[PDB]
Amino acid sequence: MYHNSSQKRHWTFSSEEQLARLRADANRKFRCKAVANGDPVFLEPHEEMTLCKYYEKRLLEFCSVFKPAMPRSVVGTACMYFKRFYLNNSVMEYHPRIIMLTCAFLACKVDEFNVSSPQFVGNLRESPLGQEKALEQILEYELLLIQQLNFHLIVHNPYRPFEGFLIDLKTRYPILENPEILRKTADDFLNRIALTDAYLLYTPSQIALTAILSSASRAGITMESYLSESLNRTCLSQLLDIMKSMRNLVKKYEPPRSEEVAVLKQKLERCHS
Amino acid sequence: YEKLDFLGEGQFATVYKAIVAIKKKDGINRTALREIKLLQELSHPNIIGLLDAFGHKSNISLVFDFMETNLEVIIKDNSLVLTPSHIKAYMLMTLQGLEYLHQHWILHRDLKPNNLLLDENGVLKLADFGLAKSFGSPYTHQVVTRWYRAPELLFGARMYGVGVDMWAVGCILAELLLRVPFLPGDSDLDQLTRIFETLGTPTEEQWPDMCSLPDYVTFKSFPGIPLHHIFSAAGDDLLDLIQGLFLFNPCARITATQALKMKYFSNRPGPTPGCQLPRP
Amino acid sequence: ALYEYQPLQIETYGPHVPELEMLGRLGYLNHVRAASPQDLAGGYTSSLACHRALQDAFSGLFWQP
Ligand SMILES: CC(C)c1cnn2c(NCc3ccccc3)cc(NC[C@H]3CCNC[C@@H]3O)nc12
């Protein structure tokens, strides 16, 4: 259960400033090791974050067309693996593409979504020689990915909390007729919350409730009585502040631009070549 | 970690004694990944703890607390008698481990006397989580060693619950009272035949949905031996516990918390303290 | 020396979840998929699914990192 999971303990952070500190630590550590190995080729941490967001979108696209059908749990686990890996590691040491493919591989294995290696690499849109090469790289980096996660592989997603909240709303909140209306739009909000850093800052239940309440507010419906009655004034204020931080995080998010990402891609390839 | 002794070789890995026990294309073995992912999210005195994990290339090594022995060595041993207090103590440690495991929605699915490891201080931990799986989402029936497999599993159950563990617990309980395997079948059909020839052939009242299991076939009726005839020296509370654990209906079968709330554990004598449990 | 049952004490940092035996009479099972008789043969009930969903919804809702 989440309330005693490793995700709550080691992978939930107090502020995004600490996250930026970890990313800058990784970037400067790679820079120091590289200059020790014997410059305008290096990337700044904000550029690394841009590339990481672009490759998180790439991982989403890879998982969306995967055959056999991949459950939402596997996709969420893979994306959380990507975020956790690139918290403490640089894109200029380990290429993000091989890392996201390894994230999908490890997520499929850990989630008990039994798929063999040949059909997994058959999902890649490459030649059989390229598919064999990609499989070899994935097998090389699987152990490194597991080590960088500190062997914490169980990821608690907000999907089951979302389902439980909908069940509870159907049962105990007769003011809101047809809670299933909230299923679609809140789902959208969840997607957006996935693109931000909130998965490392908050809990899955808070993310699900924030999505539900945002969907209700967008629909023109208030559910403050749900929190006060059905669900402590200090605790309510804490929850409202968490929800406000969630909405601010989703609002301030900016997608990576095509030209910037292309420049960063050629720069990163120069770093790797 | 400095190696001290060779401890054993398994189908999936090999265990050495370093004091810890270290256990060492598709890629990383899925049983090892399952043990890693499940033993990291758990912390109970009666569940084996994963201390640290590390590996090389496609191989990994897992670090565990060193375990002196298991329940099978105790059962098969002939120079130690098993008092009711010792049986109650083993049963209690097993059931608290299983209660904590079930609360977190995990089925062990490989409960047998060898998988119940024992500390040097007489502490029992459930181990071998290579077949463990989380339950509670709307599986393979070929789980659990056949001598401890439940009739629902032998009848081809796809979705099940804590009952598949509890039956094994009951089997283990029987193996503690007779010192021999309770229902030692050779095949699925033979195992079902021995179940029905010892405990009777359940009707539709004992199991409302028997005929709904895909591997269900009709057996001839049997006059099941009364439990007080099978377990002669047991008591009334112990017989009630056995009957609850060996109920044919998996929904009606007692859970770990319900078993812990039975009068058998509360009644005199109390469980033997862990430091006084027998040592092979 | 007598054993005495004490329930597990685990902090969930969230709202209380109604127990398994009370879900049906509180109206929760009316909003979950009903288990087929094949599921019931193996010991599967919709109560377990509803319980797990509610426990996930309420786990750590009032917790701050
Ligand atoms: C890997 C971990 C769970 C562990 C800790 N101590 N220990 C020992 N101790 C030696 C021993 C055990 C039982 C009886 C006599 C000696 C043996 C051992 N053997 C590996 C498998 C064999 C089958 N049963 C489960 C074991 O983990 N695995 C372990």
Side-chain angles (χ1 to χ4, degrees):
Chain A
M1 287 309 294
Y2 171 75
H3 50 259
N4 53 339
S5 70
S6 65
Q7 161 174 344
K8 152 161 165 294
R9 169 54 246 142
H10 313 278
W11 298 97
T12 326
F13 301 90
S14 39
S15 48
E16 69 200 315
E17 290 83 59
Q18 192 200 339
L19 290 194
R21 283 201 296 272
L22 291 166
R23 295 176 169 102
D25 196 349
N27 187 237
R28 81 130 199 91
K29 277 175 99 299
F30 176 82
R31 282 176 183 242
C32 293
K33 183 158 73 272
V35 301
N37 284 2
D39 273 332
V41 79
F42 282 151
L43 277 293
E44 292 110 49
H46 73 97
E47 297 166 315
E48 291 196 25
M49 265 297 327
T50 319
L51 276 175
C52 279
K53 288 148 75 165
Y54 169 83
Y55 277 96
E56 181 93 294
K57 285 230 291 305
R58 303 265 74 62
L59 175 56
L60 253 70
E61 292 195 352
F62 167 75
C63 284
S64 75
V65 301
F66 190 96
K67 316 264 185 331
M70 188 177 308
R72 266 190 335 239
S73 180
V74 190
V75 180
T77 307
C79 305
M80 167 82 60
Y81 281 164
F82 198 74
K83 286 180 190 295
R84 286 187 198 186
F85 175 83
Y86 275 130
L87 253 186
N88 297 297
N89 286 279
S90 190
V91 298
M92 270 146 36
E93 190 165 356
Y94 311 111
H95 205 287
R97 169 179 192 169
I98 301 136
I99 287 300
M100 53 168 243
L101 286 186
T102 317
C103 280
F105 191 80
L106 182 64
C108 286
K109 300 175 83 176
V110 157
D111 186 90
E112 303 277 345
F113 175 49
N114 304 283
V115 165
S116 76
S117 298
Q119 39 184 157
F120 182 92
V121 294
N123 279 282
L124 314 165
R125 328 199 193 102
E126 293 212 23
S127 71
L129 316 187
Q131 291 178 8
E132 259 326 272
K133 193 152 143 278
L135 176 47
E136 209 29 68
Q137 308 188 79
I138 289 162
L139 297 186
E140 292 159 10
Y141 275 165
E142 220 207 326
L143 183 64
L144 158 81
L145 172 59
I146 297 181
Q147 280 174 328
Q148 290 308 295
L149 300 156
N150 285 321
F151 290 81
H152 303 140
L153 313 177
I154 286 299
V155 167
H156 288 281
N157 278 272
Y159 317 128
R160 189 142 58 245
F162 182 90
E163 293 300 329
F165 269 126
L166 248 56
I167 295 176
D168 202 60
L169 278 174
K170 291 167 198 166
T171 297
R172 285 196 314 156
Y173 206 65
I175 286 172
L176 174 56
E177 321 293 355
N178 205 11
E180 280 277 349
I181 304 160
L182 310 188
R183 182 176 284 283
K184 171 163 180 174
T185 283
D187 166 62
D188 294 359
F189 208 71
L190 270 164
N191 295 350
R192 284 161 65 41
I193 300 185
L195 266 35
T196 88
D197 230 335
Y199 279 18
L200 299 158
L201 303 169
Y202 312 106
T203 83
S205 49
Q206 289 163 12
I207 301 176
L209 186 68
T210 301
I212 295 169
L213 258 73
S214 146
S215 59
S217 318
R218 189 178 184 187
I221 286 101
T222 52
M223 307 160 45
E224 268 272 23
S225 36
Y226 182 50
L227 307 183
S228 59
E229 314 320 6
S230 303
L231 260 295
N232 195 359
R233 281 61 135 163
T234 294
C235 216
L236 178 63
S237 59
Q238 267 157 345
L239 200 66
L240 291 178
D241 276 289
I242 284 174
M243 230 153 282
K244 210 209 322 296
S245 311
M246 286 247 183
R247 280 177 254 118
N248 292 342
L249 255 202
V250 177
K251 148 262 280 183
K252 75 210 264 194
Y253 171 81
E254 244 190 66
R257 305 182 302 266
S258 295
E259 293 84 358
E260 196 207 341
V261 170
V263 153
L264 301 190
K265 281 151 91 313
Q266 54 147 33
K267 210 169 319 157
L268 175 61
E269 288 157 11
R270 275 196 291 119
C271 302
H272 277 286
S273 74
Chain B
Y1 293 130
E2 45 172 354
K3 285 193 175 182
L4 179 55
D5 189 34
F6 184 78
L7 268 197
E9 165 84 10
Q11 137 78 14
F12 285 101
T14 176
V15 182
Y16 324 77
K17 172 183 183 175
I19 293 182
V20 294
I22 299 184
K23 182 200 233 235
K24 322 192 334 173
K25 200 53 232 179
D26 203 285
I28 306 278
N29 187 242
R30 286 174 141 105
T31 281
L33 270 189
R34 157 166 329 118
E35 262 219 311
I36 283 167
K37 87 194 180 196
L38 289 179
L39 284 193
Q40 282 273 56
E41 314 298 328
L42 299 164
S43 183
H44 193 275
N46 291 326
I47 299 193
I48 196 75
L50 188 61
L51 310 185
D52 168 300
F54 60 91
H56 220 328
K57 312 173 178 194
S58 291
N59 313 354
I60 314 195
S61 76
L62 317 183
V63 183
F64 296 103
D65 250 338
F66 177 62
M67 291 318 258
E68 218 38 74
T69 167
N70 49 2
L71 249 198
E72 169 151 59
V73 167
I74 293 279
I75 288 172
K76 280 168 168 273
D77 231 359
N78 279 3
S79 184
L80 49 96
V81 302
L82 288 199
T83 67
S85 292
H86 298 158
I87 301 174
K88 185 181 296 185
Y90 292 133
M91 267 318 267
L92 247 174
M93 264 161 315
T94 306
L95 276 170
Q96 309 182 268
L98 223 46
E99 186 201 13
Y100 176 88
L101 194 65
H102 288 153
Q103 234 168 60
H104 293 76
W105 298 87
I106 299 167
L107 295 185
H108 188 290
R109 305 192 313 168
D110 229 22
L111 288 99
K112 27 175 180 190
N114 68 353
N115 282 350
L116 295 188
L117 303 193
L118 258 79
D119 260 11
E120 46 158 347
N121 302 317
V123 181
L124 181 147
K125 307 185 202 298
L126 330 173
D128 208 316
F129 279 69
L131 287 190
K133 192 152 203 218
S134 62
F135 79 105
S137 208
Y139 294 82
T140 174
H141 45 292
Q142 198 66 25
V143 86
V144 189
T145 304
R146 183 187 293 110
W147 295 358
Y148 321 82
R149 198 171 314 164
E152 58 263 34
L153 285 186
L154 287 148
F155 273 151
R158 312 321 271 121
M159 286 304 333
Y160 35 85
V162 303
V164 306
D165 290 343
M166 317 296 334
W167 186 281
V169 158
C171 293
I172 284 168
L173 181 52
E175 202 155 335
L176 289 165
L177 295 161
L178 308 172
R179 313 300 297 253
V180 280
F182 187 42
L183 304 163
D186 310 5
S187 42
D188 294 354
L189 293 174
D190 181 32
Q191 183 70 37
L192 277 154
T193 318
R194 310 177 77 102
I195 296 154
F196 294 163
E197 104 192 287
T198 290
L199 302 165
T201 311
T203 75
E204 79 287 339
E205 86 187 332
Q206 330 200 41
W207 198 346
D209 304 347
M210 225 158 171
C211 319
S212 52
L213 295 142
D215 299 6
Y216 169 77
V217 297
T218 278
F219 290 64
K220 90 167 196 58
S221 288
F222 277 105
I225 312 172
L227 307 174
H228 73 275
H229 282 134
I230 302 161
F231 314 100
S232 70
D236 316 47
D237 48 344
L238 184 45
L239 283 175
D240 296 355
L241 170 72
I242 291 168
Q243 177 222 99
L245 282 175
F246 273 122
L247 273 178
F248 286 114
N249 188 13
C251 308
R253 198 173 302 147
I254 63 181
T255 61
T257 170
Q258 290 173 7
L260 293 162
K261 277 196 254 261
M262 266 216 178
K263 322 201 58 46
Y264 168 63
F265 300 104
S266 311
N267 281 346
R268 203 160 270 113
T272 286
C275 43
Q276 270 228 285
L277 284 178
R279 299 283 298 268
Chain C
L2 251 73
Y3 170 76
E4 227 272 342
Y5 180 76
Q6 283 131 67
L8 281 180
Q9 313 295 338
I10 271 75
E11 177 60 40
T12 56
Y13 307 91
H16 188 230
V17 188
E19 281 333 270
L20 199 62
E21 312 81 41
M22 201 75 36
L23 289 176
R25 81 162 47 62
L26 285 176
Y28 289 105
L29 301 191
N30 305 349
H31 308 105
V32 83
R33 178 200 67 94
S36 69
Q38 198 219 296
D39 305 358
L40 295 158
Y44 185 84
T45 47
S46 71
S47 281
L48 300 163
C50 187
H51 204 36
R52 180 169 210 207
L54 296 168
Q55 298 209 318
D56 274 51
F58 290 170
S59 188
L61 185 55
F62 316 139
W63 190 75
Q64 264 222 351

